[PDB]
Amino acid sequence: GGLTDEAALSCCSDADPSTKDFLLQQTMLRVKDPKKSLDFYTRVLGMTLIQKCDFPIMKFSLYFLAYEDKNDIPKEKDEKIAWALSRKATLELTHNWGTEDDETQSYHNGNSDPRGFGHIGIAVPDVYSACKRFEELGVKFVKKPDDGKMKGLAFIQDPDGYWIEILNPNKMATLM
Amino acid sequence: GGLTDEAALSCCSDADPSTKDFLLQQTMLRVKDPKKSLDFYTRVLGMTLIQKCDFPIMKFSLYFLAYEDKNDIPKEKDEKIAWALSRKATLELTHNWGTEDDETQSYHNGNSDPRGFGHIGIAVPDVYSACKRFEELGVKFVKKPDDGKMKGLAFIQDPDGYWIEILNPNKMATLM
Ligand SMILES: [Zn+2]
Ligand SMILES: [Zn+2]
């Protein structure tokens, strides 16, 4: 019912040289409360806050989180922004000021109508021991690693209810 | 209205050693028509299809796209999946079989109510020359690099209407 390999590959062009050193730099999610999100992404998931930008006239902040050594963060503001925004695989969290106070407000995780965005995913060396730690930290699960057909694979949720896949690259081969 | 830098840093914990091997492996978007998506991400954006997975009983396919040399893709199926799913900064496109035929169906890009997910972002060497090429390829723009206050920064849309930021890490410093 899907594409054959031939049909999919036929729609794939070789990369034009004008796209050399293009990189997938960021995924942007809106967060209700940056205090809860920064705590979750740093303390639970082990990411580093590499850059914060505030736009007072437009009333929002941007928070860039990445799996980066905090010692590699430049100290010069100009160099720091250029370094942060040239890292692969960053998470950009957008804070619209006031949402944290608004009892009525929440963001949509794209896993109920209307769907689109599904999840971010973290590759971990040990899914079961990562999930044991998540459980002990009181993390909310969508899919415990032992539930359903796909054993050794988990989904958790962040403070806004965004889904985070927890996967082990070797266990994914075997699940085929 | 937002956090001070000190208040943001106050909410950040240092990385637990159990998280030091973790990497931000994927961002998952649902795509209506994988033929249009594969063409756009490979031919326009220069990504490589590194893995295709078909789940007949669940009626979906997964397409993993990444800025990777096609010569680095292992040929052994087991090695290929372990390699693909251990790459940083991949895009996972989910094809729910039949959506391409369904006149009634489309995915939500998260940038109108209900909001959450905002965009993926590509770092390029030269935003103006990247965008000149995008225009000549017929790409739909949300924001041309010279439109609005934020000059030197662009948003395009993919075939499902997902927003893709086109940014240059150095031009972002100056926009502060
Ligand atoms: Zn962005
Ligand atoms: Zn996934």
DSSP string across chain A: ----HHHHHHTPPPPPGGGTT-EEEEEEEE-S-HHHHHHIIIIIT--EEEEEEEETTTTEEEEEEES--GGGS-SSHHHHHHHHTTSSSEEEEEEETTGGG-TT---B-SSSSSP-EEEEEEE-S-HHHHHHHHHHTTPPEEE-TTSSS-TT-EEEE-TT--EEEEE-HHHHHHT-
Straight-line distance from the first to the last Cα atom of chain A, in angstroms, rounded to the nearest whole number: 18
Where chain A is discontinuous (C–N > 2.5 Å), the residues before each break are none
* Structure token digits, residue A109: 């995780």
| Residues of B noted as catalytic | 165
Question: How close is the nearest chain B Cα to the Cα of A46, in Å?
Answer: 4
Confirm or reject contact between B166 and chain A (CB < 8 A).
no
Report which of B102, B24, B173, B139 is spatially closest to residue A23, judged by C-alpha positions: B24
Measured at the CA of A155, the angle between CA A152 and CA A157, to 5 degrees, comes to 155
Please give the Cα distance from B165 to A10 (Å, whole number): 27
Find residue A60's DSSP bridge partners.
A55, A96
Give the amino acid at A144.
K
A59: left (phi over 0), alpha (psi -120 to 50) or beta: left
Please give the Cα distance from A127 to A144 (Å, whole number): 10
Cβ contact, residue pair B38, A8, below 8 Å: yes
Experimental technique used to determine this entry: X-ray
Pairing of strands B48-55, B23-30: unpaired
Burial class (CB in 10 A: 0-12, 13-18, 19+), A45: buried
Please give the Cα distance from A31 to B75 (Å, whole number): 40
List the binding residues of B. 26, 30, 92, 96, 115, 119, 149-150, 165
Please give the Cα distance from A44 to A159 (Å, whole number): 11
Torsion, CA B8, CA B14, CA B19, CA B20, rounded to 10 = 120
Specify the DSSP element, H or E, that contains B55: strand B48-55
Contact A100, A33 (CB under 8 A): yes
Please give the Cα distance from B119 to A30 (Å, whole number): 10
> Taking every pair of C-alpha atoms in chain A, what is the biggest distance, in angstroms?
54
Find residue A52's DSSP bridge partners.
A63
Phi, psi of A132 (to 5 degrees): -55, -50
Resolution (A): 1.9
Distances A134 to A40, A43, A144, B128 between C-alpha atoms, Å: 11, 11, 10, 44
Phi, psi of B73 (to 5 degrees): -70, 115
